[PDB]
Curated annotation (Swiss-Prot), chain A:
Protein role: Binds together with bS18 to 16S ribosomal RNA.
Protein name: Small ribosomal subunit protein bS6
Annotated GO CC locations: cytosolic small ribosomal subunit
Key words, A-Z: Ribonucleoprotein, Ribosomal protein, RNA-binding, rRNA-binding
Similarity section: Belongs to the bacterial ribosomal protein bS6 family.
A single BP term in Gene Ontology: translation
Organism: Pseudomonas aeruginosa (strain ATCC 15692 / DSM 22644 / CIP 104116 / JCM 14847 / LMG 12228 / 1C / PRS 101 / PAO1)
Keyword Disulfide bond: no
GO molecular function: small ribosomal subunit rRNA binding; structural constituent of ribosome
Portion of the parent chain present: 1 to 103 of 139
UniProtKB/Swiss-Prot annotation, chain B:
Any single GO CC term annotated in Swiss-Prot or TrEMBL for this entry: cytosolic small ribosomal subunit
PROSITE patterns, alphabetized: RIBOSOMAL_S11
Any one Gene Ontology molecular-function term assigned to this protein's record: structural constituent of ribosome
Annotated keywords: Ribonucleoprotein, Ribosomal protein, RNA-binding, rRNA-binding
Primary role: Located on the platform of the 30S subunit, it bridges several disparate RNA helices of the 16S rRNA. Forms part of the Shine-Dalgarno cleft in the 70S ribosome.
Family annotation (InterPro entries): Ribosomal_uS11, Ribosomal_uS11_bac-type, Ribosomal_uS11_CS, Ribosomal_uS11_sf
Source domain of life: Bacteria
Disulphide bridges, residue numbers: none
Name of the protein in its database record: Small ribosomal subunit protein uS11
UniProt xrefs under SUPFAM superfamilies: Translational machinery components
Taxonomic lineage: Bacteria, Pseudomonadati, Pseudomonadota, Gammaproteobacteria, Pseudomonadales
A Pfam family it matches: Ribosomal_S11
From Swiss-Prot, chain C:
Lineage: Bacteria, Pseudomonadati, Pseudomonadota, Gammaproteobacteria, Pseudomonadales
GO molecular function (one): structural constituent of ribosome
Interval of the full protein contained in this chain: 17 to 75 of 76
GO biological process: translation
Family: Belongs to the bacterial ribosomal protein bS18 family.
Keywords: Ribonucleoprotein, Ribosomal protein, RNA-binding, rRNA-binding
GO CC term, one of those recorded: cytosolic small ribosomal subunit
Subunit details: Part of the 30S ribosomal subunit. Forms a tight heterodimer with protein bS6.
Origin superkingdom: Bacteria
Function: Binds as a heterodimer with protein bS6 to the central domain of the 16S rRNA, where it helps stabilize the platform of the 30S subunit.
Keyword RNA-binding attached: yes
Designated name of the protein: Small ribosomal subunit protein bS18
Curated annotation (Swiss-Prot), chain D:
Name of the molecule in the record: Small ribosomal subunit protein uS15
A Pfam family this chain is assigned to: Ribosomal_S15
Family recorded in the similarity comment: Belongs to the universal ribosomal protein uS15 family.
Keywords (A to Z) from UniProt: Ribonucleoprotein, Ribosomal protein, RNA-binding, rRNA-binding
Length: 103, 118, 59, 89, 55
RNA sequence: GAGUACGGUAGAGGGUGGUGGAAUUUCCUGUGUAGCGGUGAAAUGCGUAGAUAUAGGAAGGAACACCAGUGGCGAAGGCGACCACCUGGACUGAUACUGACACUGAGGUGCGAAAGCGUGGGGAGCAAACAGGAUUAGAUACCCUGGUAGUCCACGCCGUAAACGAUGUCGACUAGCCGUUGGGAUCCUUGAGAUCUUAGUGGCGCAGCUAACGCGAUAAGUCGACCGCCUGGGGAGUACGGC
């Protein structure tokens, strides 16, 4: 029941299944009362530095409203998936729906 | 032999006690090198900017045999000769595309040694 | 100019990033103490996601 | 302040002496007791949280002081409070 | 700490811009401070004097 | 006075787990050739078995550059990378509620830097001891080259510091001026400053105090409650006994 903002980087070779992964996560998050209040896709951005060896990656922005179990389950998916790298989960006191990066 | 390298990179490892100039390619393969201590300057004269340019000039002409005319300067470390060695690269035939300081800066990492109680 | 400082908003972030990639002090920019504290946490947080370099000599 | 607003709103009305009453010692003692017992779970898992234990001790001392004042005022009201809350161990 | 030499200028003024970039970044001061380990008492004592001089 | 209920604000407050970048070291590989390193100068040391330098890769540990600020939080000791979880307090606005429920505190109990001790891990840098090189009349040092405990982690112990603001806690009063942090109110609704107010944090300064230095709303001024402590220096915070 806490608003979480998640930004994760997907490997450039796995850029075309970021839709397949996000559709899995959104389904897997709302099965216990979750809702997605925000979801963008910043696309293949040139990295300021190489994470491991890639200088470009698929950023995905997603703001959710979940519980402890759902957030731990989702964070588990990020950890045991080499496709995604350099993820960050934020806690928000309020839900937002603007873009602020696309423009 | 002649590698026939046109683009190079020059590294100046200037320190408080010695200055090591090393000319390398774009992939970090060294061709020539000279040091202030290797140019007849020992002791108080090894840590002087004049010894630095002598080292840079000595390695500079040793590097033209590869047919090198373009290089980027990568000066690293403090000391008397960080700039005096670069000015030596201009006296001999060369054009410097860029000058960059690559001195390593810890982000408060390993503990440095203690103050000298001289 | 009612703008909220955030890590995605890179355009104003670069205004408070020095040429070498450091964070400019509040004295140079004349920023309020509250804004700079929230400004710094955005630069570091965006630094994590490879949006900004930690230093200019990255590589 | 580990108690949520729902839990605080829950226990205030069961121990209020009248409508709108949130300052009576019964509400205070019940408010502290629920927070004291809730924090016991945290200090079991976090045994090195000495700084949060200073606050817990203050809540224990505060509850003792309130009960001693309720002792002087009305001993019958004091007796019902600890019996309902299970204090005086 | 990084300058690019442009077309049709002397290399001398390319040097002066280079160190001007260096002191702007202050790399020489940073390496001087990390030469030896300054104890927390000596570091806090130095910063206290820095605040006094500023005021 | 003290406290509770509500919204909000800031924070290196604390605990538990992950994650990142810079750098050091070690190892592997390529280039490449006489030095590197160090100092006042040297030498010990490293290097022709290919060092240093340079480039690519790997492992590992520790601390978190810039932000950074007589800035912030904490009872004090202390706390600086980011994120998630658990959690304490403070500040702030009005209304609502209890109605002296308060202060201090011998014993007692809890926390308490660093060093140190025990068990188990870990170990990159630094470095008591130790070894060698210098300097010196000598040098069990200062300087240099190495380097063990330790520094790191968990669980226990210790219980001491110039643990200092060398200033016990709490409450009230007594000109002002110049900064700064978190709020609030009113003019400015200003776009953007100004005036009050509050909790901190600094610099001058009237009065007052002080042996003087200086303190001066964060008092060492005018008071009040309580507590701790002192009675010339050395012997000595030592001996003896107790814990």
């Amino acid at each position: 029941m806490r608003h979480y903002e998640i930004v994760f980087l997907v490997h450039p070779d796995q850029s075309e299944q970021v839709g397949g992964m996000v559709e899995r996560y959104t389904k897997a998050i709302e099965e216990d009362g979750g809702k997605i209040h925000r979801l963008e896709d910043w696309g293949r951005r040139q990295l300021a530095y190489a994470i491991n060896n890639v200088h470009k990656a698929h950023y995905v922005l997603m703001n959710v409203e979940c519980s402890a179990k759902a957030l731990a389950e989702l964070e588990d998916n990020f950890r045991y998936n080499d496709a995604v790298i350099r993820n960050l989960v934020m806690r928000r006191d309020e839900a937002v729906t603007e873009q602020s990066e696309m423009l | 032999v002649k590698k026939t390298v046109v683009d190079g990179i020059a590294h100046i490892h200037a320190s408080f006690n010695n200055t090591i100039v090393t000319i390398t390619d774009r992939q970090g393969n060294a061709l020539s090198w000279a040091t202030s201590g290797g140019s007849g300057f020992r002791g108080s004269r090894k840590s002087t900017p004049f010894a630095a340019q002598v080292a840079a000039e000595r390695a500079g002409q040793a590097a033209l045999e590869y047919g090198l005319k373009n290089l980027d300067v990568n000066v690293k470390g403090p000391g008397p000769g960080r700039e005096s060695a670069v000015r030596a690269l201009n006296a001999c035939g060369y054009k410097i595309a860029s000058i960059t300081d690559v001195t390593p800066i810890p982000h408060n990492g390993c503990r440095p040694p203690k103050k000298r109680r001289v | 100019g009612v703008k909220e400082i955030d890590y995605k908003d890179l355009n104003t972030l670069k205004a408070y990033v020095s040429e070498t990639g450091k964070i400019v002090p509040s004295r140079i920019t004349g920023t309020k103490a509250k804004y700079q504290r929230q400004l710094a946490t955005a630069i570091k947080r965006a630094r994590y996601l490879a949006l900004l370099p930690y230093t200019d000599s990255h590589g | 302040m580990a108690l949520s607003v729902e839990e605080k709103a829950q226990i205030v009305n069961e121990y209020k002496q009248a409508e709108g009453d949130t300052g009576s010692p019964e509400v205070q003692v019940a408010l502290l007791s629920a927070n004291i017992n809730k924090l016991q779970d945290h200090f079991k898992a976090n045994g090195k949280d000495h700084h949060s234990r200073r606050g817990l001790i203050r809540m224990v001392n505060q509850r003792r002081k309130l009960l001693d004042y309720l002792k002087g005022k009305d001993v019958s009201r004091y007796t019902a409070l600890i019996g309902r809350l299970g204090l005086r161990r | 700490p990084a300058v690019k030499v442009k077309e049709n200028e002397p290399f001398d003024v390319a040097l002066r811009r280079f160190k001007r970039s260096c002191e702007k970044a202050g790399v020489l001061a940073e390496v001087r401070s990390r030469e030896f380990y300054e104890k927390p008492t000596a570091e806090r004592k130095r910063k206290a004097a820095a605040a006094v001089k500023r005021h």
